[PDB]
Nucleic acid binder design. Structure first.
Length: 204
DNA sequence: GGGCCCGCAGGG
DNA sequence: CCCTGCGGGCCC
């Protein structure tokens, strides 16, 4: 539903599980990387190193579309086994870009800052191929905007949709000096589900 | 009512 | 250690 930050949830907020990010409003889907409607646009997305074509550079990153995958056998993830399409959440994210939607060669917003805002969450699994992933769980990293998107062959050899997102947010990134100071001042700390830690105090 | 899914953990 | 496939929410 909502575009932009969630009122009163500062950049640097951390949650241990995806479900907690969801109940916060920050990223509603419990599994999916993109939260979006195909005739409106995308509200939030997660970098979790789930797609090999994701490259994260912090203040900007190239995100991969979802799909191009065989999820037979009641799967949630798989390797690329066919071309992605500009449909569903992929189409949603493309609409955020401040340029006419083109599903053949993609598009670029000259005035990208005028595009729709995307809430961006970074998850620890993104750490294999990124300097910007938190050490644990999920972290709210602020607002980014889609500069451009285009199709190309991924590492797998199949077509993927690729999106350049660039940061556009007055709250500083949590990996920066000021981001770290703010987090410290606010006392931001990993949020666990209720009862979770107690259940872990059950090592015997 | 069916599709989708950047998680997660039980059980091998 | 590695593997399998479940709920449930949200979309359409």
């Amino acid at each position: 539903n909502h575009y932009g930050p969630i009122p009163g949830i500062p950049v640097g907020t951390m949650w241990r599980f995806r479900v907690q990010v969801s109940e916060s409003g920050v990223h509603r889907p419990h599994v999916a990387g993109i939260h979006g409607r195909s005739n409106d646009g995308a509200y939030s997305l997660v970098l979790a190193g789930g797609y090999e074509d994701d490259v994260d550079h912090g203040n900007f990153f190239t995100y991969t579309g979802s799909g191009g995958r065989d999820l037979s056998g009641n799967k949630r993830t798989a390797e690329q086994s066919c071309d992605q399409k500009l449909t569903n959440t992929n189409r949603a994210l493309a609409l955020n870009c401040f340029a006419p939607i083109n599903d053949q060669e993609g598009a670029e917003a000259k005035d990208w800052r005028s595009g729709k805002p995307v809430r961006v969450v970074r998850n620890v699994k993104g750490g294999k191929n990124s300097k910007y992933a938190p050490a644990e769980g999920n972290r709210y990293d602020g607002i980014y905007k889609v500069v451009k998107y285009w199709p190309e062959k991924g590492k797998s050899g199949f077509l993927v949709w690729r999106y350049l997102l660039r940061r556009d947010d007055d709250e500083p990134g949590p990996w920066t000096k000021e981001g770290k100071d703010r987090i410290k001042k606010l006392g931001l700390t990993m949020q666990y589900p209720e009862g979770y830690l107690e259940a872990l105090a059950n090592a015997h």
